[PDB]
Amino acid sequence: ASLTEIEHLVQSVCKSYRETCQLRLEDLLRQRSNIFSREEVTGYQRKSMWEMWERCAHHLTEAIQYVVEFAKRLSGFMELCQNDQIVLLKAGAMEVVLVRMCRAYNADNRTVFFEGKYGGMELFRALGCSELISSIFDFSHSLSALHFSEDEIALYTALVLINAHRPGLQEKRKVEQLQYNLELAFHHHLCKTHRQSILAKLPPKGKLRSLCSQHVERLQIFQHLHPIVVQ
Ligand SMILES: Cn1cc(C2CCN(C(=O)C3CCCCC3)CC2)c2cc(NC(=O)c3cc(C#N)ccn3)ccc21
DSSP, rough: OOHHHHHHHHHHHHHHHHHHHHHOOOOOOOGGGGOOOOHHHHHHHHHHHHHHHHHHHHHHHHHHHHHHHHHHHHHHTTTOOOHHHHHHHHHHHHHHHHHHGGEEETTTTEEEEEETEEOOOOGGGSSHHHHHHHHHHHHHHHHHHHOHHHHHHHHHHHHHSSSSTTTOOOOOOHHHHHHHHHEEEHHHHHHHTTTTGGGGSOTTTTTTHHHHHHHHHHHHHHHHHSSSOOO
16 A cells, blocks of 8 residues: 555545435535425424335435445445445445435525425424434534535545444454555545644544434334335
8 A cells, every 4th residue: 555546545435426426515505595485394294203204214215325336436345245345334324324414404594405405303393203303413513514525525434434343344454454544545635635624523433323323223113113114
């Protein structure tokens, strides 16, 4: 490994992200003025918890499909064994979705893009998950204050996936090497772009894991009762 390799890694991660980012940031930004009316919000608040679960499931499986397309474009990732790829995605794909959410979050009015328009947390009322919804909003809010560039999101979410602390990895050392190369690529790119100051503002160690845990615990509860997810 060396610095020209590290530069090509940055270019390459950031390219995979652009190809798998789901919606272009500029599309998400321009859609900010498209907000659910009070009548639309009400129509959402009236759905059963089951219908909202269906809609959130569909929303998430579609976000996860881009994250899997992202991983599969990653340099080091396809060279990892079949088991390690599965262990990393199972543990990290939802964490990556939680990070990616900040692009579709508008801090000025605390709304998120969901099914074609922006709406506030109250849109999700019928779920009966207001503690967890409001943690997810807070997490998005605090990432949103960093004003992440696409390439920064690209590198940070790559680091979210390639984490050698996942239990059940068989080639731990190989995942370690790719993790440390990504961490170094991230630092390097921050220096190139005079953005070192964001390292201190990243979510503390374990805030993401624990939020994702609580998120998935709740999905598993809806799933055991209305199994809408397949595989
Ligand atoms: C903060 N926050 C919360 C939400 C939704 C997620 C689903 N929910 C659940 O899974 C649970 C919540 C708890 C219990 C089960 C259901 C309910 C709450 C959300 C969506 C977005 N939107 C995009 O990322 C987005 C990005 C793209 C792109 N590119 C395209 C479309 N949307 C942004 C911020 C968000």
